[PDB]
Every structure is written in C-alpha cells, then in structure tokens.
UniProtKB/Swiss-Prot annotation, chains A, B:
Protein name listed in UniProt: Alcohol dehydrogenase E chain
GO cellular component annotations of the record: cytosol
Annotated residues for binding of Zn(2+) 1: 46, 48, 67, 174
Reaction(s) catalysed by this chain's protein: a primary alcohol + NAD(+) = an aldehyde + NADH + H(+); a secondary alcohol + NAD(+) = a ketone + NADH + H(+)
Residues found modified as N-acetylserine: 1
Binding note for cofactor: Binds 2 Zn(2+) ions per subunit.
C-alpha cells in the first residue's frame, strides 16, 4: 500500500558545501523499470561522505549523500529479478551491471555504469527520484543512503542473508570491504610479509584486518593521531608510528624499520603527499603500493618515475577490487560465520536524526565508524 | 700471456658530456679477487649509452660507457668459480649477487649491488681498473663494454653457450631481454589482449616481440617517426600510429581504437609526458602500464591519482624483470633453440672504431641496433 505511490519521508539533504545536513521531508518517487525502493535501516558515516561536504569530492548539489548502508526492500519496479519486497539488501555504490567489459573481466570491478568518475548525481536514466521543497535533489553514487527511503537501480543493490544484523553489515557496503579487499585482493598480501598502512580510520583498520588475515608478519600503522594506535594494534598492527615524532621523513623511517622497504604499503588517507610517501616506502625492486584514499578534486601529484623504474608496482582501487554484487552477499555470509569482525570499527551509534553530531565526531578525530539508525 | 699483467688496449672514452667518444689507448688492470677480465667481441649501441652523452643520465665522468655486449674471458681473479678463461660471456649491467633481499625474492631483479641508483662508476670495491693518459677513468654500470678489454665483478658476468654468435647475442645483454621481459615477465601480457607500445626502437621492438609471443591479439605501435612502422609490423604490431597525425591526444585515440582502453601499455622512450599518456591509455579498471624508458635526470612527472584509484596498475622495471645471471644463459640457449629472433633488431654492423658514426645513426632516427665489432 505504499507500492506505486510517492513516499514522503525524512532525509539529510546537503544544500551547500561546508554546511550541516538539513534533516527534512523529501518526496521519494516509486521505482521505475529495473529499480528498487529500499527502506533504510542503518548507514555508516564514511570519510567520503564528508569529502562531499568539504568539496574534496565534487558531485552535483543539492544532494542526498550516503553510500555505506543496509536496509529492507519496500517495492520493486517492473522487470526486477534479483531482489523482492522484504529482502535485506546493501546498496552498491560501485554497480555490477554484469554486461560491460569490466564486469566481464576476471579482475575488474569498476563497472562502466558507475557514477564516480564523472558524477551526474542521477539514476541510470539520468533523472532523480527525490524532490525537496518542490526542487529536484541529486542522488549520490546511485545509492543516496542518508534517507529513510531511497531508490536504486537493480545493478546497484545486492540481496543479503535474511538473518543479517543490518546495524553491523552496513559496513560491508563500503569501509570494511574496501580496506579488507585492498589488502587481500588488490595488493594480494603474502604470508610473512611486512605491510605499512597510512591512515587508521575505518578503512585503514580494515586494511590491517586484511593484512593480518593474509598472514603478514609485520604491520606498521601510520597516523598523525596517536589516539588511533590502540585500536590499530587490537586488529593486528604490530608497531604504530606517528610521523610527527621523527626528524626524518616517514618513508625513511619506515625503510629503516623494514630493513630496506616494506612488501606492501597502503595510502588510506587521501593526500597527494602521503600517496607518494607510501609508494616510496615500499621496497624499490619488488614492493607494491595501493592507493585507497580519495584525493582532492582535480589535483595532480608530482613524483619521480625512477621510483617505478626500479621495479615498484603502484595501483589503486575502488571498493577493495570486489565485484560488488557477487561479493557483498558472500562477505555477509562470511561475517555471519565469524570469518571477520566488524565491531572493532564501530565506536559510536546514533539515531539518523543526529547525523550532524556523527559528522562532528568524525571531524574531531574521535570516531572510527558511527552507525546511524533510522 | 696477458694474465696478471696490465693490458694496453683501445677503448672509447667519454671525457665530458655532449662530445664525441675519444677512441684511444687505455690501461686495463688485471682482475682482483672475484673479478673477471673480458676480451670484448661485440657491443650494441643502446639509447641509454646516448643518455650518458646527452646528460639525460648522470654518471661520473670521465667514463667508459657501453653495457650491451658479449666477449670472451681473458683471465679470472682469485676465487672466481662461475667462469673460466676462454668462456663466452655477457656482462650484466644489473648484477646478481645471490645474497641480498632482492636476489632472494622470487620476483625482484634489481640487486642491491647495482651501480644504477647512486652511480659511483667503480668496481664493487670502489676502485677503477682503467686509466687513460695517466688519469683514472670511471666504469659504467659495472660493465664498460666500449673497450677491447674490460674488468667486471663476478656477480656482473654470465657464462653463455660456447657456440653462441656473439655479434647477435650481445643484444641479450640489454635491449632484447629488457623489452621481451617487460612484456612477458613484468606486464605478464595475456593471450588475446590488446597492447600499446610507445617507442619503436630496439627495446620497443623487443616489447612487441614479447607481446606477440604472449599471444596478444592486437599490438599498437606508437612512434613519431613513421619510418619505424614497417619493422614494428614485421615483428608483430597489428597497427601503427603517429601522434602527430591526429588532432586529439593519442591517449584518446588509443582508447577509441581499443574500445575503451588497452590491456597493457609500455613506455619505451624516456619522456615524462609519454609515461603519463601510456598510463592513461590502459583501461581504467584493469589496465597495466609498464615504464621501460629512462627519463631525464631528477625530473618529476605530474599525474592525477584518479588514474590509479579506478584500478590501473603502474609499474616499471630494469632489464625486463630478469634475474640477470640466472636468465641470460637461458635466453641465449633459447635463442640457439630458435625460440626468438634477434636479426630484426640489427640494422647496422660497424667496426668499433666507428662508434661515433653508430651514435650518429641512432640520433638521426636511421638505425635500430648498431652492433660494433672489435
Ligand atoms: N577507494 C575506496 O573505494 C574508498 C572507500 C572508502 C573510503 N575511501 C577513502 O579512504 C580514506 C580514509 O577513509 P576513512 O578511513 O573513512 O577516513 P578517516 O576515518 O578520516 O581516516 C583517515 C585517517 O588518516 C589520518 N591522517 C590524516 N592525515 C594524515 C597524515 N598526514 N599522515 C598520516 N595519517 C593521517 C587521520 O588521523 C585518520 O585516522 C578517505 O580518503 C576516503 O574518502 C576510499
Ligand atoms: N628499463 C631498462 O632496463 C632499459 C633498457 C634499455 C633501454 N631503456 C630505455 O628505453 C628507451 C628506449 O631505448 P631504445 O629502444 O634503445 O631507444 P631508441 O632506439 O631511441 O628508440 C626510441 C624510440 O622512441 C621514439 N620517440 C621519441 N619521442 C617520441 C614521442 N614523443 N612519441 C612517440 N615516440 C617517440 C623514437 O622515434 C624512437 O623510435 C630509452 O630511454 C632507454 O634509455 C631502459
Ligand atoms: O568511500 C567510497 C568512495 C570512493 F572511493 C570514491 F572514490 C568516491 F568518489 C566516493 F564518492 C566514495 F564514496
Ligand atoms: O639501458 C639500460 C639502462 C637502464 F635501464 C637504466 F635505468 C640506466 F640508468 C642505464 F644507465 C642503463 F644503461
Ligand atoms: Zn558493468
Ligand atoms: Zn566510503
Ligand atoms: Zn643481490
Ligand atoms: Zn640499455
């Protein structure tokens, strides 16, 4: 009896950069063909959502952000075959259309239907399902999870285990999967190796988790906030270092600590300088460095290509290299079987209505993940 | 006998940048412990040797350059076990000590004993075996092949098949092995893939050979000198393109040609701009780009890390990723077994005394490899 009808509900609308979200009523159109309307249950605050506020990440405004979430299907449009009303689902900010050259490639996951490279802030059909104050409001990465209801394309949603705890498994929608996959799938961390992880937020902790799962012998956590070190050790960091404590640049420090460079390094911050430092600190002949952090819009880094010529490998990835729709249900199943833990990432819980407090907690350095409940 | 005695012989000395080689008499000391003195038979002219002349590469002068060569052992120092007087050998400009962390690593080949990173222009012991007009002359990459006799450390020489034609297999000492290994070992080019090769000199042609050998379906040769195209097609290029023919940047052209980007790209020139263009032209989600060219000293490139975040892999390598002492004898054996051709790389064969004329041929665009015969 809400099926086929416009739903009025509360969402967190971002009208302008560098402003608080406005929690207010929006209108959510019913799903069109191959679309799915989802009642949100839990959503995490990822630093990439903050990047939209700060203008680090440029996407059309006004917008309903949010991309790390889980909820329950309210209704499905014509021709949907992969979810049903009442199913538990995770929106996929990286789609999996299953048809494009990337989806068909054994390794690739950055599906060509993504809204990340050149954001339009729309559904796949170039239109919006959201109205607020009578004005159209942009989507974000096809997900727009900061709303009591959202509409996503079918290629941007995965059915998950019906017994899943949504307030935990929402993290599988971005931070955990990204960090863990960056280590196990993208870098392919090896048993006995030495790893360095730059940035010990939600995603960097997940990288550490993945490095420890892959059997790394030494895992160096690097952060300018020493308050982040205790938790990093808890999830597998063997040593933590704060660049501020040292006279030498940290790439030199880490090279010394690793007797000539690390096997695998990860940038999980989003700064051009730490992307280069992270590359430099991996062993010059065989080291691998993975960029996970999101850089500031349109800015280029400068580097000496001799860092590569010696034999380093440099790569980046979205969503841990996981093919999203294939991978998310499996990751949930694995979580339900206790193959990895999510609680170490969750430091704060708040109602959706306190979204701004949640962002304050992230910006202050106090939280890892705050989970918002609808 | 010459063993244990200084040899007076002819070498090509480079007294200063941007001048002709001086062909004149030098004194070559006998080998010390773990050293090998080699009578040179044939040496190729590699663009890297030109970079020493041009100042693109910085290495101490005065110098005896040359690193792509083959000869016959004249004498050995105490303690040498891997070669004997009379053996055919190839000097190894990337050593293989067998003891360092890189030599012990299954993938790495940039042995920590190399003289490339921080060139000293000496023997492993920090001294020189060469004098000319009473002045010490530096070595180059532990090899110094532009001389009738050179002295190399044992870790910088490999014994090869006694029946090898030295005037051909000298190419295994640099250009062939570098290009071929860059394709087959570093990129790990796959069957049915699309490849783009920037630069169609000796090394880029060898990259093409490797891509074809690895079963690439399409191989795009890219050069501003259209005279290089015929030979590129002979060795496997399926299409050749000259960036100067197009109004659009060539990365865009190549992306269109490859219906969204290539599987593997190779920079085989040594320009910062083409390194970035080569990266960009590989498919954004799963593409791999390998830097082979040597860039001008101390210059940084500028790039947008979003090219990596989407999923690209960027890497570089020295000597095709090959562990040099293990690999060079096997490559020579494979050549003798007709597994690959070297003649397509050889455009000119000149006596050593015409070294300058050979560099002029390279610089004018007219040659691929000139082989100099002693
Ligand atoms: N590639 C992907 O798919 C993907 C997915 C998730 C998040 N991201 C990005 O990954 C980054 C981390 O996200 P997150 O974990 O939620 O963020 P976060 O919780 O802000 O963590 C970042 C950490 O970096 C630390 N830091 C800041 N500056 C420095 C410095 N100069 N040196 C060392 N440490 C420093 C900081 O103290 C904090 O603990 C952000 O840029 C995100 O946008 C990318
Ligand atoms: N990584 C290694 O171990 C290694 C080994 C051997 C050589 N190298 C380097 O690899 C590069 C190629 O060496 P080579 O094959 O002897 O040199 P080469 O024979 O001069 O070939 C270079 C080719 O690049 C072409 N070229 C120049 N500018 C451009 C441009 N803007 N766009 C397209 N094509 C262009 C040029 O026409 C020529 O055919 C040089 O920088 C060498 O120093 C590196
Ligand atoms: O945190 C995941 C995430 C990314 F990795 C991006 F590259 C991006 F543009 C974005 F909006 C985002 F949410
Ligand atoms: O051509 C091989 C070669 C290189 F790949 C270098 F990086 C270098 F510095 C050099 F001197 C050289 F000869
Ligand atoms: Zn797709
Ligand atoms: Zn995220
Ligand atoms: Zn070594
Ligand atoms: Zn060379």
């Amino acid at each position: 009896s809400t099926a086929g009808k416009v739903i009025k509900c509360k969402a967190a609308v971002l009208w302008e950069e560098k402003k608080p979200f406005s929690i207010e009523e929006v209108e959510v159109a019913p799903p069109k063909a191959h679309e799915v309307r989802i009642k949100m249950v839990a959503t995490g605050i990822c630093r990439s959502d903050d990047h939209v506020v700060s203008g680090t990440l440029v996407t059309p405004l006004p917008v309903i952000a949010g991309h790390e979430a889980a909820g329950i299907v309210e209704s499905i449009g014509e021709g949907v075959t992969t979810v049903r009303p009442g199913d538990k689902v995770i929106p996929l900010f990286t789609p999996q259309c299953g048809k494009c050259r990337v989806c068909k490639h054994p390794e690739g996951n950055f599906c060509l239907k993504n809204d990340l490279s050149m954001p339009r802030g729309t559904m796949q059909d170039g239109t919006s399902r959201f109205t607020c104050r009578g004005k159209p409001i942009h989507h974000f990465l096809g997900t727009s999870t900061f709303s009591q209801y959202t509409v996503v394309d079918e290629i941007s949603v995965a059915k998950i285990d019906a017994a899943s705890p949504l307030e935990k498994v929402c993290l599988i929608g971005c931070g955990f999967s990204t960090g863990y996959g960056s280590a196990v799938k993208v870098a392919k961390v090896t048993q006995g190796s030495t790893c360095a992880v730059f940035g010990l937020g939600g995603v960097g902790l997940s990288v550490i988790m993945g490095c420890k799962a892959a059997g790394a012998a030494r895992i160096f956590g690097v952060d300018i906030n020493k308050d982040k070190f205790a938790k990093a050790k808890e999830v597998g960091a063997t040593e933590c270092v704060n660049p501020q404590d040292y006279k030498k640049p940290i790439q030199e420090v880490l090279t010394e600590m690793s007797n000539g460079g690390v096997d695998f390094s990860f940038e999980v911050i989003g700064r051009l300088d730490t992307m280069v430092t992270a590359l430099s600190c991996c062993q010059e002949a065989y080291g691998v460095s993975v960029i996970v952090g999101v850089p500031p819009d349109s800015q280029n880094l400068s580097m000496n290509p001799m860092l590569l010529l010696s034999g380093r490998t440099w790569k980046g990835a979205i969503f841990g290299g996981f093919k999203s729709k294939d991978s998310v249900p499996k990751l949930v199943a694995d979580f339900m079987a206790k193959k990895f833990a999510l609680d170490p990432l969750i430091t704060h819980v708040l109602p959706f209505e306190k979204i701004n407090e949640g962002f304050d907690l992230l910006r202050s350095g106090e939280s890892i993940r705050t989970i918002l409940t609808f």
